[PDB]
């Protein structure tokens, strides 16, 4: 058994790493702290952390939005400190309930939401630059920055793009623990059971696959951890016995395999496609499809089942039946 794959039995300490970046070496902040219990399942050193203009813009815009949201939450309980801590999950900031179209809604009905939405967007955009710039500041590929973009893009879809495309701010996602959860069903109901949106199935297929892949890959690297498999950069440019057996375990199992490099393209793609498929689903939704179930019925894809309890005629269509 590998006791190293469970926890690191013997832990190592030494002088701080510091690799210079093209800029901002001085804007690193924090004296690095060592946690013994953290270092049983990760590296013990916590910090330092890089500030830099994009990073601080993120916290500025971000906090601004959160403040808006928390303040609007506090008012929902008359600013009672007890009830706020109590009802917190039920509290939220809601998009306009009346139909103002794309017109900027009143502060008490959607206004504060739109503004909190705006500052949140600025916050995400600020952090993106951080993710991007830090990559090429350290002479690294922007693979992370572009994955993070797909997630940012999708949030924009459910946040403002799809609202703009259908022409209503009322279709936005509220801020809150339960309230933003409530939106999920209101949106699915409105558009005819989202189980019948193909890009929904696609997005799910990719998300599940993200589970499968890093369950398999995560376990794969643990299995060849005795051969220093976790050292992957120097297993790509230079193949050793770790991914020899890793490539062969899967080749003997499913009939084909990847490389130590290419398996990372598989996981990056799957993750990307969770967002890519989702965004396409939301865009199509409302715009060009108004009921995904009926859309499937039209194309003869929807399943049909025999009656258990008798067929029930729509009473609204009965002769003499009320409005």
């Amino acid at each position: 058994a590998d006791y190293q794959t469970i926890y690191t039995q013997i832990q190592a300490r030494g002088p701080h790493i510091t690799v210079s970046g093209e800029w901002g070496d001085n804007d690193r902040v924090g004296k690095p702290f060592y946690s013994y219990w953290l270092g049983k399942i990760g590296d013990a050193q916590i910090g330092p952390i890089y500030l830099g203009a994009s990073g601080i813009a993120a916290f500025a815009f971000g906090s601004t939005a959160i403040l808006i949201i928390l303040f609007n939450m506090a008012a929902e309980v008359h600013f009672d400190p007890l009830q706020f801590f109590r009802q917190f999950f039920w509290l939220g900031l809601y998009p306009p309930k009346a139909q103002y179209g794309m017109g900027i809604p009143p502060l008490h009905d959607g206004g504060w939401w739109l503004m909190a939405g705006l500052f949140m967007t600025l916050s995400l955009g600020s952090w993106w630059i951080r993710v991007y710039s830090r990559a090429r500041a350290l002479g690294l590929g922007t693979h992370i920055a572009w994955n993070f973009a797909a997630a940012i893009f999708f949030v924009l879809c459910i946040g403002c793009i799809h609202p703009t495309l259908v022409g209503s701010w009322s279709e936005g996602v509220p801020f809150g623990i339960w309230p933003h959860i409530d939106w999920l069903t209101a949106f699915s109901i409105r558009y005819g059971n989202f189980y019948y949106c193909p890009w929904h199935g696609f997005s799910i297929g990719f998300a599940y696959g993200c589970g499968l892949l890093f369950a398999a890959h995560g376990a794969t690297i643990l299995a060849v951890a005795r051969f220093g498999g976790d050292r992957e950069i120097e297993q790509i440019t230079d193949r050793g016995t770790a991914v020899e057996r890793a490539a062969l375990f899967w080749r003997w199992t499913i009939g084909f395999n990847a490389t130590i490099e290419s398996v990372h393209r598989w996981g990056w793609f799957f993750s990307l496609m969770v967002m890519v498929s989702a965004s396409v689903g939301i865009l199509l939704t409302g715009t060009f499809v108004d009921n995904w179930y009926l859309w499937c019925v039209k194309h003869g894809a929807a399943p049909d089942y025999p009656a258990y309890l008798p067929a029930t005629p729509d009473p609204a269509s009965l002769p003499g039946a009320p409005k």
Partner: protein, 273 residues
């Protein structure tokens, strides 16, 4: 037929049962005893699905469905057309999954590596049992289990979730979803990082393990490490079905109301009410 570095490894041994008898390869596939039993269960299972699909007004994949019995049959045997086909296929599916798992144990054994992959594979097998056996057994009938059809089994999940009003409030479900999300996130980060170091652009120098840790020290103020991301990863991915199983088995056997109401334990406490 073989990889450039492969024949080095194709030695005998590492069998659990069978010895030399099934210790051989078919193309790139290893067989072993559990290769033989897998094919048996898979042939039988697919045949049953085929013969069952023979019978309905079937044939286009999206409309093909093989359903469990009525609730009234309890845990008893059902008429093959009225649920029995499902019962058998269920069994075959379990034979196939477990075989596939132990086959992986045999392959790990011959390669001299840890058994982490087939041990990981026990988690989805486990969840399948929760859905198709466990929760039915507690509820008393097999008819509570999901049907085998590409679209039909979605409608099973759909109705089941609504049977508890808003399935979103299911705390077991909240944990499960949380793990599915963060796992997809971590996979994107990790794969993206490794590529960033090996594929950094233009006429480049491939960067180092110090650049790895470097990057996440700057962005979030911590890097978990090269080896630790892989145990973290197996941890997040596994806890999808490890935590989610609680919310599934709790629905029915241990809770019959809507899941939003379940949070009455927090909301209805006398000194907040």
């Amino acid at each position: 037929a073989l990889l450039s570095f492969e024949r080095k490894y194709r030695v005998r041994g590492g069998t659990l049962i069978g010895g030399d008898l099934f210790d051989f390869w078919v193309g790139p596939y290893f067989v072993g005893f559990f290769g033989v039993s897998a094919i048996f269960f898979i042939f039988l299972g697919v045949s049953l699905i085929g013969y069952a699909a023979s019978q309905g007004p079937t044939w286009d994949p999206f409309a093909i469905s093989i359903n469990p019995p009525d609730l009234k049959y309890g845990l008893g045997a059902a008429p093959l057309l009225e649920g029995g086909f499902w019962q058998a296929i269920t069994v075959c599916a379990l034979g196939a999954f477990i075989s596939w798992m132990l086959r992986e144990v045999e392959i790990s054994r011959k390669l001299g590596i840890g058994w982490h992959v087939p041990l990981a594979f026990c988690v989805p097998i486990f969840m399948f049992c929760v859905l198709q056996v466990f929760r039915p057994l507690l509820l008393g009938s097999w008819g509570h289990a999901f049907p085998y059809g590409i679209l039909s089994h979605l409608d099973w999940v759909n109705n089941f979730g609504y049977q508890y009003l808003n399935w979103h409030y299911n705390p077991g479900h909240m944990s499960s979803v949380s793990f599915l999300f963060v796992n997809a996130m971590a996979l994107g980060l990790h794969g993206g990082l490794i590529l960033s170091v090996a594929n950094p652009g233009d006429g480049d120098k491939v960067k180092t393990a110090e650049h790895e840790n470097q990057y996440f020290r700057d962005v979030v103020g911590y890097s978990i490490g090269a080896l630790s991301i892989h145990r973290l990863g197996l941890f997040l991915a596994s806890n999808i079905f490890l935590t989610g199983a609680f919310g599934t088995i709790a629905s029915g056997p241990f809770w019959t109301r809507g899941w939003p109401e379940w949070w009455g334990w927090w909301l209805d406490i006398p000194f907040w009410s």
